[PDB]
Amino acid sequence: DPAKAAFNSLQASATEYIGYAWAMVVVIVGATIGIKLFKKFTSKAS
Amino acid sequence: DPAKAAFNSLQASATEYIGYAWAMVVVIVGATIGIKLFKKFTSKAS
Amino acid sequence: DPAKAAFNSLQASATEYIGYAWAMVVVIVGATIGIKLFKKFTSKAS
Amino acid sequence: DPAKAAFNSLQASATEYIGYAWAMVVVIVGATIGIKLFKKFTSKAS
Amino acid sequence: DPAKAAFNSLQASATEYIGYAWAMVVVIVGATIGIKLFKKFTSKAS
Amino acid sequence: DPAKAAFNSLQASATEYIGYAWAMVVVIVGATIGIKLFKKFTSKAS
Amino acid sequence: DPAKAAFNSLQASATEYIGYAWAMVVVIVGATIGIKLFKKFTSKAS
Amino acid sequence: DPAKAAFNSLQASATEYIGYAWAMVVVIVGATIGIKLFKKFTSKAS
Amino acid sequence: DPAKAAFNSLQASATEYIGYAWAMVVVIVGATIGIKLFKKFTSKAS
Amino acid sequence: DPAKAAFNSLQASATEYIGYAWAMVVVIVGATIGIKLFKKFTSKAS
Amino acid sequence: DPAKAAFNSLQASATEYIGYAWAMVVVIVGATIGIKLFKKFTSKAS
Amino acid sequence: DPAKAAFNSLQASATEYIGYAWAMVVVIVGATIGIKLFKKFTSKAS
Amino acid sequence: DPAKAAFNSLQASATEYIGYAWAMVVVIVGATIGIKLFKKFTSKAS
Amino acid sequence: DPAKAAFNSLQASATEYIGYAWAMVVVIVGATIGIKLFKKFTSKAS
Amino acid sequence: DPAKAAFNSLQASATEYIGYAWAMVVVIVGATIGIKLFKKFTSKAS
Amino acid sequence: DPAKAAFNSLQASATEYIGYAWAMVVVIVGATIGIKLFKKFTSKAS
Amino acid sequence: DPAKAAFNSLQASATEYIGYAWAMVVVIVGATIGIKLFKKFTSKAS
Amino acid sequence: DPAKAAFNSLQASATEYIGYAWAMVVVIVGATIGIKLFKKFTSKAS
Amino acid sequence: DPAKAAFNSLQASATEYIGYAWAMVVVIVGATIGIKLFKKFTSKAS
Amino acid sequence: DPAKAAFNSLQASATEYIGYAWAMVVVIVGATIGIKLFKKFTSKAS
Amino acid sequence: DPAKAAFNSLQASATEYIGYAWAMVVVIVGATIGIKLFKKFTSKAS
Amino acid sequence: DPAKAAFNSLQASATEYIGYAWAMVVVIVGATIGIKLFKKFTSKAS
Amino acid sequence: DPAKAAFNSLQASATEYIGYAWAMVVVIVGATIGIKLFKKFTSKAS
Amino acid sequence: DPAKAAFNSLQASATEYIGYAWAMVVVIVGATIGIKLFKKFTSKAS
Amino acid sequence: DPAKAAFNSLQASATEYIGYAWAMVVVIVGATIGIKLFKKFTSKAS
Amino acid sequence: DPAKAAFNSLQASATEYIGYAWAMVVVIVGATIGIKLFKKFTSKAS
Amino acid sequence: DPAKAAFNSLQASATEYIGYAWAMVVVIVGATIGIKLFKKFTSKAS
Amino acid sequence: DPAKAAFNSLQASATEYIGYAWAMVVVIVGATIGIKLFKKFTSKAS
Amino acid sequence: DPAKAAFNSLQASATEYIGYAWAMVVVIVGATIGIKLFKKFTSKAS
Amino acid sequence: DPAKAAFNSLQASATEYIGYAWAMVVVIVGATIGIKLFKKFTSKAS
Amino acid sequence: DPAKAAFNSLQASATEYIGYAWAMVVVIVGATIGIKLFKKFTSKAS
Amino acid sequence: DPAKAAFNSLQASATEYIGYAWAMVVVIVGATIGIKLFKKFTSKAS
Amino acid sequence: DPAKAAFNSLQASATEYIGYAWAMVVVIVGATIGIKLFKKFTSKAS
Amino acid sequence: DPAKAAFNSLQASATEYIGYAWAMVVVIVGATIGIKLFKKFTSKAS
Amino acid sequence: DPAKAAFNSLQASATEYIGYAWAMVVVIVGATIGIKLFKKFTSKAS
Amino acid sequence: DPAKAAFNSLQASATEYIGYAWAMVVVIVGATIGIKLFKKFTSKAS
Amino acid sequence: DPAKAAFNSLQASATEYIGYAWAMVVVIVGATIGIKLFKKFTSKAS
Amino acid sequence: DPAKAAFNSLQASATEYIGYAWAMVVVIVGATIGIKLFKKFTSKAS
Amino acid sequence: DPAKAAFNSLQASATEYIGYAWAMVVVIVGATIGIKLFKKFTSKAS
Amino acid sequence: DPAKAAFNSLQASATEYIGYAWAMVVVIVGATIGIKLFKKFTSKAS
């Protein structure tokens, strides 16, 4: 079925995009949470 | 009647399309909800 | 009248086709509405 | 006149055919409108 | 007048032939118009 | 004049035959025109 | 006069022949007109 | 004139046939227009 | 009358041909209407 | 009367020929009307 | 007129669809508002 | 003119059908607008 | 000239027949065109 | 001369017969042309 | 000329039919546009 | 020459009859062409 | 030539009928076009 | 022209619809803005 | 050419109808845009 | 040859009648085609 | 010889009659063919 | 006007919904502002 | 009758053509509906 | 009767010609109707 | 009598010639009717 | 040839009608496109 | 042989008349075919 | 029989022409259907 | 018998001419039917 | 042969008329296609 | 046989006329069908 | 015998005249049939 | 009613989705409020 | 056969016209699809 | 049947075109869905 | 240009709405900033 | 070509509409951005 | 072939119109996309 | 088939459009994500 | 390719808008971050 192959390729492409999205969000959140913890720990320790 | 068999085949084809659509939407929504919960919980815990 | 039996056979065929249509539209609309509710509720619950 | 009786019997046959046509159109229009309203009201409710 | 009798007999023959002709006309024209109206009403009803 | 009486008899006989002929012509044409008009108007009305 | 009596005999004999001729003319003309009208009315009827 | 009376009779017969034709066309056209407007207005309302 | 029997035979033959014509038109019109309604209802269901 | 017997023989002969002619006319017209009606009804049915 | 009864039946069918739609929308909106108020009040109280 | 009464009857039928249409559309539009306002106001009030 | 009188009388007969023919033509053509315009205008107005 | 007088008598008698012949011709030709034009104009009128 | 009067009376009948058609089209177009504007303005206001 | 005078009279008589015939032909054709053109132009205009 | 005058008269009559035909077609076509443009522009404006 | 009056009436009908729509939208927007300002000012003041 | 005046009258009627259309669309579009701006600005200002 | 002159004169008559016929043909066909093109172009332009 | 001279006289007289006959034939045939072609070309022209 | 009554009923229904919306928002805001003031006053007083 | 066999063989050929038509329409309708459902379900899932 | 034999032989010739005619009719009409149905079914299936 | 014997011889000889004439008539009439029916049936068949 | 001039004059009339049609279509298309673009650009700007 | 010379003269005269007849036939047919083709091609081109 | 061979030859010629007609109609119908499906499928794909 | 031999020769001559006539008839009809069928099938195929 | 030259002349005349017909149809079809494509492309661009 | 030669010469004339007729038929029918296909293909391509 | 020799001379002279008659018949019949077929085939060709 | 069963199944499916949504939101809110209370109580107690 | 060559040359001309039609439809369809895809992809990218 | 091969070739052409359509729609839909997912995921990840 | 005036009035109406929006936002912001400053200054001063 | 000038005029009209739209959107967006920045900066500064 | 030049001129006209369409759509789409980007970027930047 | 090449060319054109769309969307989304991240990181760091 | 140039100009216009957007966002963010740092540093230093 052409439709079966089409739907399978669309789902495979979606999975690749999800992989890239997760890589980017990890990098962004790492920085936001890192900066938050640094500012919090520096002031608290002082 | 040829129409009876034709209508039945089209309904079976629609059922196949619904199966493909549900599989893709589960993957798509799963990633969306996962990223949302990840950012939310990370902010609350840190 | 040969027409009386002809018109009757055509109206019986129409009634059969309306039943095949009301079985396909239930399946298709049910799936689309189900996907809509699934995405909506997952977003609100998360 | 023979033509008088002929014209009257033809106008009688035409009236019978009109009745058959009206009965069939009611069923078909009812089905098409029913499916249209079903889809509209379902989408609005969801 | 043998001629008067001849003309009178010729008219009865003509009148009979006219009756036979009218009967066949009604049957044939009724059928053709019946098929015409049948096709027209079926198309509009569908 | 015997010859005059003869001419007068044959002319009177001709007039009789002309009257009989005219009556038959009216009957034949009326039937034909009736059939023609019936077919035409039945086709037009439908 | 014997000659006058002979004339009367000739006239009476001729009258008999005129009657026989009229009977022959009626049947022959009837067939000719009958077949003519049959073909005419059958054509118009069909 | 024999023709004068014959022509008048044929014109009167034509007028009668016109009356029958008008009655039939009114019934048929009325039904076809009614079905058309019914389908149109049902669609607009829905 | 020879013409009487001939006219009756032709009218009977016409009735037989009308029966064959009605059978064929029912089959053809039924198929065309069926294909039309099939395409219409499949579109509405989808 | 020898002349009477002669007229009687020729009239009887004419009647025989008229009967033969009528039979042939029925066969020829029946065929033509059959072909005409077959073509007309075949065109109408389709 | 058949149209009058047909229009009345279609309006009655529309009323039934409206009843089904309102029941579903009350359940759907009830859940949506309930979840929203639940999260809001829990956050304010705690 | 038979047409004057025919056109008048058609315009009277049209006026009746427009009234049946303006009764169905009021019910349908009223319901859809009511559902829209219901969802909108419940969201803002909550 | 008995011939001049014959030709003059023949023309008056022809002129009368032409008047009768024209009267019948106006009635028949008026009706056919009236039905044609009626059907056309009803369809466009609807 | 008695012979010359006899010639004059023959000429006068012939003139009378020519007049009777002309009257007969006028009525017969009038009927023939009248029926011809009647059939022609009735056909064109219808 | 008889045709002159005939053409003029036909052009008069056509003008009357145009008036009837215009009156009907105004009512039908008014209703369709009225329903269209009602739905549009109601949706915009809500 | 008496024979010459005779030929001259018959030729003059023929010319008279030819003139009368031409006048009648113009009247008959004019009527027929008028009816034909009236029907054609009335059909075309509508 | 009698034919020359007759042909010229028939051509003049044809020209008159063309003038009547053009007047009628202008009125009818104008009305049909006007109704068409009216419906089109009302829809575009709404 | 009937179209001129029809277009003017439709424009007047549109003006009425606009008046109804503006009245409803003022009430609808008034409530929306009122609730928004109520919640905002209450939070700021308290 | 009668057509030159006919085509000119049709183009003049078109120009008039375009003006009636450009007066209705200005009113309708103006109202819809006014309602859109009203709702948008009230929301931002509040 | 009085015959040669007769044939030569007959041709000139025929040639004149052909010229008259062609002139009338051009006028009638020009009008019918003009109306045909007028109706076609008006419909496409509108 | 007187007999030979008489023969010559008969031949010369016959030649004169042949000439008169030819003149008569030309005018009569001219009218017959002229009316025939007039009717033929008028029919084709219309 | 059916449209007038429809628009008036829609506005009346909207006013009822606005009444319910205001009742609900007063209850919600009472609680949110009450809890806020309680927490604020309790801590400040302590 | 030869026509009986002819009508039967034509109704047999028509049935064969109906089978070919139904087979083709099933393939084409299946493809169009398949593409329609594919696009709809894909868009909804994404 | 040599005439009876002649009439009998003429009928067999006629009957043979009718058989030949019917055979050719079936072939030609079958082909024309086959092409007609082929074009109709191909268009509807596509 | 020798004269009586001669009469008998003449009658017998005439009978022979009547037979030869009948054979000639049969073949000639057969060809005439055969070609007539051939042309008639070939035309109807095509 | 008269036909040559006739064909040329008809091709000249057709060219004139094409010019009138093009002028009218430009005005109508300009108006419809103008209204379409007006509504589109206004909505986008607001 | 005087008789031979006579036959030779009449045959030569016949050939002359045949040549004149052929010339006239060409002129008449050419005109008729020209008119027929002009009408046909003018109808087809438009 | 000469007619037997002639009828058979004409039927064979008809069969040959049917073969040529079928070949041409297949090519033309195939192209028109192909263009139709090409435009339809390109639109669906886009 | 010399008279018998004469009748036999004329009958043989008639048969020869009948054979020649039949051959010419076949050639003429074949051509006409071929042209008719070519035109019909060429029109149908396209 | 006189007919040979006549047939050749008529075929040449037909070719000339075909040239005039092709010129006119190219101009008319070109204009109608141009107007169609103009309206289509303006709509697509807008 | 001078008759055999006459029949043989008549056939060659007929065969030539058939060749000339067929040539003209091909040219005329080719042109009409060419214009028909041209108009059809231009419309579908556009 | 001188009488027998005279008989032989008469027979030989008659044979010469029969030959001259046959030559005359051939040319006259050829022209009649030639013009008939020319008109027939030109009509079918066009 | 197929619509009744369809609407009932859709509402039942919605109720199931609402059950899952409530389960998920309880789990999420439990964690967010638990973490909030823990952090608040730990710091306050210290 | 001349018809064989004619049918073949017509099928050759039809094939040429199909080629021209296909070339034109490719260009027009390419342009319409190109504009459609351009607008779609541009809107999606922006 | 030539139709059996014709219908088969048309269904084979349809199957080929459906494959070309299912290759273009996969590419187009794939691209549009890919762009949708790209924009959606980039927004959520950032 | 009607469009120019329409666009100018829409822009003027927009400018008025902007004036009202700015008046309302100044009042709202005055209060929010006033309350903020009051609360801030009161506590800071204390 | 008239189309060239028409297309150029429509493109010029589109350019005018774009100029009006850009002017209005600058005013509309200017107010929107101005109010947003006003509220934002006032809150930050105070 | 006159068609070859006709089809070529039509394809050249199509190519010209496609260029005028691709110049208008670029301007219109460019403006709409420009307005979209303008509003989007101003909002994000502010 | 020309369709095969046409479909392939259209798919290649679609691929080109997809390439242009992806390039533009990367630039557009890149700027959008860049501005969002710029504002977010600047606020977090400062 | 017109599409290539169009897509390239759209991308170039987008790049210019991105340049302006970045300039504006730098100015806005400079102020918001500047005010934030000033307020923070002033209070902290004090």
**What proportion of the residues of chain A is helical, as a percent range?**
over 70%
Radius of gyration of chain A: 20 Å
Predict the CATH topology of chain A: Single alpha-helices involved in coiled-coils or other helix-helix interfaces
Distance N to C terminus of chain A: 68 Å
**Class derived from helix and strand content of chain A:** mainly alpha
The major sheet of chain A is characterized as: none
Taken together, the total number of domains of chain A comes to 1
Write down how many β-strands of chain A occur, each being a DSSP E stretch of 2 or more residues.
0
Largest interface: B-C, 18 and 16 residues
Count of helical segments of chain A? 1
Beta-strand content of chain A: under 5%
Order of H and E elements of chain A: H
CATH architecture of chain A: Up-down Bundle
Q: Any idea of the CATH class of chain A?
A: Mainly Alpha
How would the global form of chain A be characterised?
Answer: rod-shaped
| Oligomerization | homo-oligomer of 40 chains
PDB class: viral protein
Keywords: Viral coat protein, M13, viral protein
Assembly: 40-meric
Entry title: Middle segment of the bacteriophage M13 mini variant
